[PDB]
Structures are given as structure tokens and as C-alpha cells.
């Protein structure tokens, strides 16, 4: 059970932190840099971000192809870290729209679409461009 290991890591991280120690997982710093980069993006690029987010509205009927086509425009002539942050913020905005319209069910699906798009399209660029460690150093 992946599940059981996760519960154990959560408890031990809590207990160590409660004693004034710090036991961070390898993806801890990546997560934090991404939250901060996404916040800064949405605050810096309100106009461009709105234009991005207005290009797609997710309904129970939407397929991945529709999401992929809009994200493909974002990366059509290649990848940079700024565009990767835009892709996260864009997913975020689609999830918020979904929940504003009481379609909470769509959040899971958007998460799977984002994970697929990362795996197929962005992870190979990231592994040739210094890994998520380079992102943390650039944005964290």
C-alpha cells in the first residue's frame, strides 16, 4: 500500500516538526516554489492570464483533446519555465471555474489531464533543462 507509507510519512513528519526538527520529502521545495511562482504569475500577468483562462471552460462533456489543444498553443514553439508556471496557473483557474459552477467532480479530471500533459510533453524538456531543482533555484 502506497497509502500506508504515505500515512506513515505524514505522521513521522508531523512528530519531528512538533519536536522542532525538519524532515522534508524530496518534492517539498518543488511544491513550495510552484505555489509561490503561481501566486506571483497570477499577480504579475492578470491580463495575459485572463486571456489564457477565457480560451477554455470545462464541462462534464469536455475531452482531454480540448484541454491539450489550448495548452499546445501555450507550448507550440517550445517550453520555458515561465510557460510551465502559466500551465499550472491555467489548470488552477479551470479547477476554480469548475468549483464556482458547483462541478467539483471535474477537479480530478483536470488533475489527470495536467499529469498526462506533464508526462508526455514537459518532463522530457525539464530533464534536459536542469530538472525541477533548476526551477527551485530560479523561482523558490
Amino acid at each position: 500500500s502506497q497509502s500506508n507509507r504515505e500515512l506513515v510519512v505524514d505522521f513521522l513528519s508531523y512528530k519531528l516538526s512538533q519536536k522542532g526538527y525538519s524532515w522534508s520529502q524530496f518534492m517539498a521545495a518543488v511544491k513550495q516554489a510552484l505555489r509561490e511562482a503561481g501566486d506571483e504569475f497570477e499577480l504579475r500577468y492578470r491580463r495575459a492570464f485572463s486571456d489564457l483562462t477565457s480560451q477554455l471552460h470545462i464541462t462534464p462533456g469536455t475531452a482531454y483533446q480540448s484541454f491539450e489543444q489550448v495548452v499546445n498553443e501555450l507550448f507550440r514553439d517550445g517550453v520555458n519555465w515561465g510557460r510551465i508556471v502559466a500551465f499550472f496557473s491555467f489548470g488552477g483557474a479551470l479547477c476554480v471555474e469548475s468549483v464556482d459552477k458547483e462541478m467539483q467532480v471535474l477537479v480530478s479530471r483536470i488533475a489527470a489531464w495536467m499529469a498526462t500533459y506533464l508526462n508526455d510533453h514537459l518532463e522530457p524538456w525539464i530533464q534536459e533543462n536542469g530538472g525541477w531543482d533548476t526551477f527551485v533555484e530560479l523561482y523558490g
Binding site: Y45, A48, N80
Partner: peptide
Amino acid sequence: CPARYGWDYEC
């Protein structure tokens, strides 16, 4: 990449 968004300028 060719700069098309304001965030491409920081790269």
C-alpha cells in the same frame, strides 16, 4: 522560444 507572452521575457 520566440517571445509571445509577457512571462517569456523573464526567460
